[PDB]
From TrEMBL, chains A, B:
<protein>
    <recommendedName>
        <fullName>Archaeal Type IV pilin N-terminal domain-containing protein</fullName>
    </recommendedName>
</protein>
<feature type="transmembrane region" description="Helical">
    <location>
        <begin position="5"/>
        <end position="25"/>
    </location>
</feature>
Length: 51, 51
C-alpha cells in the first residue's frame, strides 16, 4: 500500500508551497517607492548683492 | 508570472525619465541674457582743444 500513502503526502507538500509562493509574490509587488518630479524652474524675481 | 512583474518595473522607469525631461527643458528655457540697444547718438555740444 506504499504508493497510496506516498502519493498523498506529495500532493499536500506541493499545495503548501504554491500558496506560499503567492503570498511572497504579492508582497513583493507594490513594494516600489519611485520619485516625484520637481516643478518647473522657479522664476527669478531678483538677483543682487551687498557688502 | 515573469511578464507581469517585468511590465511594472518598465512603466515606472519611463514615467520617472519623462518628469526629469520636463524639469530640464523648462530650466533650459528663460536662460537667455541678450542685449540692450544703445541710445541714439549723443549730440555734440562742442569739439575743441588746448595746449
Amino acid at each position: 500500500v506504499s504508493p497510496v500513502i506516498a502519493t498523498l503526502l506529495l500532493i499536500l507538500i506541493a499545495v503548501a508551497a504554491a500558496v506560499l509562493l503567492y503570498t511572497w509574490v504579492s508582497g513583493l509587488s507594490a513594494n516600489v517607492a519611485g520619485t516625484q518630479v520637481t516643478g518647473k524652474s522657479l522664476t527669478l524675481i531678483q538677483a543682487t548683492w551687498a557688502r
